[PDB]
Amino acid sequence: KVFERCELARTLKRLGMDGYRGISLANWMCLAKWESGYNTRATNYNAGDRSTDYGIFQINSRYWCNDGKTPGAVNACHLSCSALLQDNIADAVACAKRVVRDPQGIRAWVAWRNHCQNRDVRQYVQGCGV
């Protein structure tokens, strides 16, 4: 499903993402925005290394979720990658909290570096009453 902006901001707030590991809601919103355009059904296969990115946060099948076809998969979130193509994002959020418990934090997503660090990202949560 494709979330509307404030609908997603309230959903992430509810699921405990605001300030999680020091990361503001606006940073999480910038990341879903540039990763998937807030679409839970988004998948991107990366032909150079045989892995696929899944869901609203584009979480990768080498490290975090298991899809059975990615060489060297660790599956650190201990989740099937199909759990991240659901309309309900509770699993996607639990795995995104796991990604950022690693020292790199949100920098793990290069799209966040390109599109969100050192930018004013407050626009992504304005008007949402969050």
Side-chain angles (χ1 to χ4, degrees), residues 40-60:
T40 56
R41 305 159 278 188
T43 49
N44 166 88
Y45 171 64
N46 305 282
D49 86 309
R50 301 182 182 284
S51 71
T52 302
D53 303 303
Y54 293 91
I56 192 151
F57 293 124
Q58 291 289 280
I59 288 172
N60 192 269

PDB file of all heavy atoms in Angstrom, residues 40-60:
ATOM      1  N   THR A  40       4.977   0.082   0.504  1.00  0.00           N
ATOM      2  CA  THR A  40       5.313  -1.208   1.127  1.00  0.00           C
ATOM      3  C   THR A  40       5.612  -2.387   0.210  1.00  0.00           C
ATOM      4  O   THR A  40       6.155  -3.401   0.646  1.00  0.00           O
ATOM      5  CB  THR A  40       4.175  -1.639   2.071  1.00  0.00           C
ATOM      6  OG1 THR A  40       2.986  -1.656   1.299  1.00  0.00           O
ATOM      7  CG2 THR A  40       3.931  -0.639   3.205  1.00  0.00           C
ATOM      8  N   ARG A  41       5.192  -2.238  -1.044  1.00  0.00           N
ATOM      9  CA  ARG A  41       5.305  -3.270  -2.084  1.00  0.00           C
ATOM     10  C   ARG A  41       6.595  -3.149  -2.912  1.00  0.00           C
ATOM     11  O   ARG A  41       6.926  -3.985  -3.765  1.00  0.00           O
ATOM     12  CB  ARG A  41       4.044  -3.176  -3.028  1.00  0.00           C
ATOM     13  CG  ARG A  41       2.660  -3.258  -2.324  1.00  0.00           C
ATOM     14  CD  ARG A  41       1.398  -2.695  -3.078  1.00  0.00           C
ATOM     15  NE  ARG A  41       1.113  -1.234  -3.038  1.00  0.00           N
ATOM     16  CZ  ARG A  41      -0.038  -0.687  -3.526  1.00  0.00           C
ATOM     17  NH1 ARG A  41      -1.041  -1.393  -4.044  1.00  0.00           N
ATOM     18  NH2 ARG A  41      -0.236   0.626  -3.485  1.00  0.00           N
ATOM     19  N   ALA A  42       7.356  -2.064  -2.683  1.00  0.00           N
ATOM     20  CA  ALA A  42       8.604  -1.790  -3.400  1.00  0.00           C
ATOM     21  C   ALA A  42       9.655  -2.897  -3.313  1.00  0.00           C
ATOM     22  O   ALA A  42      10.019  -3.359  -2.220  1.00  0.00           O
ATOM     23  CB  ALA A  42       9.267  -0.486  -2.870  1.00  0.00           C
ATOM     24  N   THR A  43      10.197  -3.365  -4.430  1.00  0.00           N
ATOM     25  CA  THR A  43      11.314  -4.292  -4.341  1.00  0.00           C
ATOM     26  C   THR A  43      12.319  -3.840  -5.372  1.00  0.00           C
ATOM     27  O   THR A  43      11.922  -3.334  -6.438  1.00  0.00           O
ATOM     28  CB  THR A  43      10.953  -5.737  -4.669  1.00  0.00           C
ATOM     29  OG1 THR A  43      10.241  -5.652  -5.880  1.00  0.00           O
ATOM     30  CG2 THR A  43      10.137  -6.432  -3.636  1.00  0.00           C
ATOM     31  N   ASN A  44      13.605  -3.947  -5.075  1.00  0.00           N
ATOM     32  CA  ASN A  44      14.610  -3.604  -6.059  1.00  0.00           C
ATOM     33  C   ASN A  44      15.628  -4.749  -6.084  1.00  0.00           C
ATOM     34  O   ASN A  44      16.260  -5.050  -5.076  1.00  0.00           O
ATOM     35  CB  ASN A  44      15.237  -2.277  -5.650  1.00  0.00           C
ATOM     36  CG  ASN A  44      16.540  -1.958  -6.391  1.00  0.00           C
ATOM     37  OD1 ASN A  44      16.524  -1.364  -7.463  1.00  0.00           O
ATOM     38  ND2 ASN A  44      17.722  -2.312  -5.889  1.00  0.00           N
ATOM     39  N   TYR A  45      15.826  -5.457  -7.193  1.00  0.00           N
ATOM     40  CA  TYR A  45      16.796  -6.527  -7.242  1.00  0.00           C
ATOM     41  C   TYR A  45      18.102  -5.918  -7.697  1.00  0.00           C
ATOM     42  O   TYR A  45      18.130  -5.105  -8.626  1.00  0.00           O
ATOM     43  CB  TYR A  45      16.314  -7.578  -8.224  1.00  0.00           C
ATOM     44  CG  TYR A  45      17.338  -8.656  -8.535  1.00  0.00           C
ATOM     45  CD1 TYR A  45      17.760  -9.500  -7.536  1.00  0.00           C
ATOM     46  CD2 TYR A  45      17.835  -8.748  -9.824  1.00  0.00           C
ATOM     47  CE1 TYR A  45      18.701 -10.466  -7.810  1.00  0.00           C
ATOM     48  CE2 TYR A  45      18.779  -9.712 -10.094  1.00  0.00           C
ATOM     49  CZ  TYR A  45      19.199 -10.561  -9.085  1.00  0.00           C
ATOM     50  OH  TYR A  45      20.163 -11.499  -9.341  1.00  0.00           O
ATOM     51  N   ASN A  46      19.218  -6.343  -7.122  1.00  0.00           N
ATOM     52  CA  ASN A  46      20.509  -5.716  -7.378  1.00  0.00           C
ATOM     53  C   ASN A  46      21.315  -6.824  -7.989  1.00  0.00           C
ATOM     54  O   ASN A  46      21.865  -7.712  -7.327  1.00  0.00           O
ATOM     55  CB  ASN A  46      21.191  -5.278  -6.094  1.00  0.00           C
ATOM     56  CG  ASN A  46      20.360  -4.344  -5.200  1.00  0.00           C
ATOM     57  OD1 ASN A  46      20.207  -3.139  -5.423  1.00  0.00           O
ATOM     58  ND2 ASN A  46      19.726  -4.884  -4.161  1.00  0.00           N
ATOM     59  N   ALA A  47      21.414  -6.726  -9.301  1.00  0.00           N
ATOM     60  CA  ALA A  47      21.990  -7.777 -10.155  1.00  0.00           C
ATOM     61  C   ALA A  47      23.485  -8.065 -10.007  1.00  0.00           C
ATOM     62  O   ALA A  47      23.937  -9.191 -10.238  1.00  0.00           O
ATOM     63  CB  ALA A  47      21.724  -7.437 -11.628  1.00  0.00           C
ATOM     64  N   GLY A  48      24.216  -7.027  -9.614  1.00  0.00           N
ATOM     65  CA  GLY A  48      25.633  -7.124  -9.330  1.00  0.00           C
ATOM     66  C   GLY A  48      25.951  -8.018  -8.146  1.00  0.00           C
ATOM     67  O   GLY A  48      27.027  -8.627  -8.097  1.00  0.00           O
ATOM     68  N   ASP A  49      25.075  -8.107  -7.133  1.00  0.00           N
ATOM     69  CA  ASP A  49      25.404  -8.954  -6.004  1.00  0.00           C
ATOM     70  C   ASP A  49      24.316  -9.965  -5.614  1.00  0.00           C
ATOM     71  O   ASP A  49      24.417 -10.599  -4.577  1.00  0.00           O
ATOM     72  CB  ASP A  49      25.755  -8.030  -4.875  1.00  0.00           C
ATOM     73  CG  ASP A  49      24.538  -7.564  -4.091  1.00  0.00           C
ATOM     74  OD1 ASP A  49      23.576  -7.082  -4.669  1.00  0.00           O
ATOM     75  OD2 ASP A  49      24.547  -7.743  -2.880  1.00  0.00           O
ATOM     76  N   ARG A  50      23.268 -10.115  -6.428  1.00  0.00           N
ATOM     77  CA  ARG A  50      22.173 -11.077  -6.271  1.00  0.00           C
ATOM     78  C   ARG A  50      21.280 -10.909  -5.036  1.00  0.00           C
ATOM     79  O   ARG A  50      20.696 -11.867  -4.515  1.00  0.00           O
ATOM     80  CB  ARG A  50      22.742 -12.521  -6.305  1.00  0.00           C
ATOM     81  CG  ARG A  50      23.501 -12.865  -7.609  1.00  0.00           C
ATOM     82  CD  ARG A  50      23.993 -14.323  -7.578  1.00  0.00           C
ATOM     83  NE  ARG A  50      24.756 -14.679  -8.772  1.00  0.00           N
ATOM     84  CZ  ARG A  50      24.257 -14.944 -10.004  1.00  0.00           C
ATOM     85  NH1 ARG A  50      22.948 -14.947 -10.275  1.00  0.00           N
ATOM     86  NH2 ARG A  50      25.105 -15.217 -11.006  1.00  0.00           N
ATOM     87  N   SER A  51      21.147  -9.677  -4.567  1.00  0.00           N
ATOM     88  CA  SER A  51      20.350  -9.454  -3.396  1.00  0.00           C
ATOM     89  C   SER A  51      19.162  -8.591  -3.807  1.00  0.00           C
ATOM     90  O   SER A  51      19.225  -7.924  -4.846  1.00  0.00           O
ATOM     91  CB  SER A  51      21.237  -8.775  -2.343  1.00  0.00           C
ATOM     92  OG  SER A  51      21.543  -7.432  -2.691  1.00  0.00           O
ATOM     93  N   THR A  52      18.096  -8.480  -3.000  1.00  0.00           N
ATOM     94  CA  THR A  52      16.946  -7.662  -3.321  1.00  0.00           C
ATOM     95  C   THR A  52      16.635  -6.820  -2.084  1.00  0.00           C
ATOM     96  O   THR A  52      16.824  -7.258  -0.924  1.00  0.00           O
ATOM     97  CB  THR A  52      15.792  -8.602  -3.671  1.00  0.00           C
ATOM     98  OG1 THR A  52      16.260  -9.375  -4.758  1.00  0.00           O
ATOM     99  CG2 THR A  52      14.503  -7.893  -4.019  1.00  0.00           C
ATOM    100  N   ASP A  53      16.173  -5.602  -2.304  1.00  0.00           N
ATOM    101  CA  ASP A  53      15.742  -4.696  -1.235  1.00  0.00           C
ATOM    102  C   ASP A  53      14.228  -4.743  -1.229  1.00  0.00           C
ATOM    103  O   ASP A  53      13.596  -4.695  -2.287  1.00  0.00           O
ATOM    104  CB  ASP A  53      16.147  -3.272  -1.502  1.00  0.00           C
ATOM    105  CG  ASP A  53      17.659  -3.131  -1.690  1.00  0.00           C
ATOM    106  OD1 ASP A  53      18.436  -3.513  -0.815  1.00  0.00           O
ATOM    107  OD2 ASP A  53      18.063  -2.614  -2.720  1.00  0.00           O
ATOM    108  N   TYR A  54      13.697  -4.884  -0.025  1.00  0.00           N
ATOM    109  CA  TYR A  54      12.274  -5.087   0.229  1.00  0.00           C
ATOM    110  C   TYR A  54      11.560  -4.028   1.068  1.00  0.00           C
ATOM    111  O   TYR A  54      12.061  -3.610   2.124  1.00  0.00           O
ATOM    112  CB  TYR A  54      12.077  -6.407   0.936  1.00  0.00           C
ATOM    113  CG  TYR A  54      12.406  -7.633   0.109  1.00  0.00           C
ATOM    114  CD1 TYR A  54      13.688  -8.176   0.141  1.00  0.00           C
ATOM    115  CD2 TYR A  54      11.420  -8.184  -0.676  1.00  0.00           C
ATOM    116  CE1 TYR A  54      13.979  -9.291  -0.617  1.00  0.00           C
ATOM    117  CE2 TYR A  54      11.714  -9.286  -1.432  1.00  0.00           C
ATOM    118  CZ  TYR A  54      12.986  -9.838  -1.403  1.00  0.00           C
ATOM    119  OH  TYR A  54      13.250 -10.966  -2.167  1.00  0.00           O
ATOM    120  N   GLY A  55      10.411  -3.590   0.563  1.00  0.00           N
ATOM    121  CA  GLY A  55       9.459  -2.820   1.343  1.00  0.00           C
ATOM    122  C   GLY A  55       9.710  -1.344   1.430  1.00  0.00           C
ATOM    123  O   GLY A  55      10.575  -0.784   0.717  1.00  0.00           O
ATOM    124  N   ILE A  56       8.974  -0.767   2.396  1.00  0.00           N
ATOM    125  CA  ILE A  56       8.982   0.682   2.562  1.00  0.00           C
ATOM    126  C   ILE A  56      10.372   1.289   2.913  1.00  0.00           C
ATOM    127  O   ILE A  56      10.676   2.446   2.531  1.00  0.00           O
ATOM    128  CB  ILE A  56       7.871   1.012   3.608  1.00  0.00           C
ATOM    129  CG1 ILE A  56       7.638   2.524   3.599  1.00  0.00           C
ATOM    130  CG2 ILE A  56       8.270   0.545   5.018  1.00  0.00           C
ATOM    131  CD1 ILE A  56       6.186   2.884   3.990  1.00  0.00           C
ATOM    132  N   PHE A  57      11.217   0.539   3.638  1.00  0.00           N
ATOM    133  CA  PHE A  57      12.578   0.955   3.994  1.00  0.00           C
ATOM    134  C   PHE A  57      13.665   0.353   3.126  1.00  0.00           C
ATOM    135  O   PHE A  57      14.843   0.529   3.393  1.00  0.00           O
ATOM    136  CB  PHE A  57      12.881   0.564   5.400  1.00  0.00           C
ATOM    137  CG  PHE A  57      12.044   1.329   6.422  1.00  0.00           C
ATOM    138  CD1 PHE A  57      11.267   0.622   7.325  1.00  0.00           C
ATOM    139  CD2 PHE A  57      12.054   2.722   6.435  1.00  0.00           C
ATOM    140  CE1 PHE A  57      10.470   1.308   8.244  1.00  0.00           C
ATOM    141  CE2 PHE A  57      11.259   3.401   7.348  1.00  0.00           C
ATOM    142  CZ  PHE A  57      10.474   2.691   8.253  1.00  0.00           C
ATOM    143  N   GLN A  58      13.281  -0.403   2.087  1.00  0.00           N
ATOM    144  CA  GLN A  58      14.230  -1.111   1.221  1.00  0.00           C
ATOM    145  C   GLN A  58      15.346  -1.846   1.975  1.00  0.00           C
ATOM    146  O   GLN A  58      16.545  -1.589   1.855  1.00  0.00           O
ATOM    147  CB  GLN A  58      14.770  -0.082   0.264  1.00  0.00           C
ATOM    148  CG  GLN A  58      13.687   0.365  -0.699  1.00  0.00           C
ATOM    149  CD  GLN A  58      13.312  -0.725  -1.721  1.00  0.00           C
ATOM    150  OE1 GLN A  58      13.994  -0.939  -2.717  1.00  0.00           O
ATOM    151  NE2 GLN A  58      12.228  -1.468  -1.513  1.00  0.00           N
ATOM    152  N   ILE A  59      14.931  -2.810   2.787  1.00  0.00           N
ATOM    153  CA  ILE A  59      15.839  -3.568   3.621  1.00  0.00           C
ATOM    154  C   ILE A  59      16.322  -4.748   2.798  1.00  0.00           C
ATOM    155  O   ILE A  59      15.556  -5.450   2.118  1.00  0.00           O
ATOM    156  CB  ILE A  59      15.074  -3.964   4.915  1.00  0.00           C
ATOM    157  CG1 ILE A  59      14.887  -2.716   5.792  1.00  0.00           C
ATOM    158  CG2 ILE A  59      15.859  -5.017   5.713  1.00  0.00           C
ATOM    159  CD1 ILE A  59      13.978  -2.949   7.015  1.00  0.00           C
ATOM    160  N   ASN A  60      17.633  -4.898   2.847  1.00  0.00           N
ATOM    161  CA  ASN A  60      18.373  -5.849   2.003  1.00  0.00           C
ATOM    162  C   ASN A  60      18.402  -7.328   2.407  1.00  0.00           C
ATOM    163  O   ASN A  60      18.668  -7.642   3.585  1.00  0.00           O
ATOM    164  CB  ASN A  60      19.795  -5.325   1.882  1.00  0.00           C
ATOM    165  CG  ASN A  60      20.574  -6.065   0.808  1.00  0.00           C
ATOM    166  OD1 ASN A  60      21.230  -7.065   1.077  1.00  0.00           O
ATOM    167  ND2 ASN A  60      20.547  -5.645  -0.447  1.00  0.00           N
TER     168      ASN A  60
END
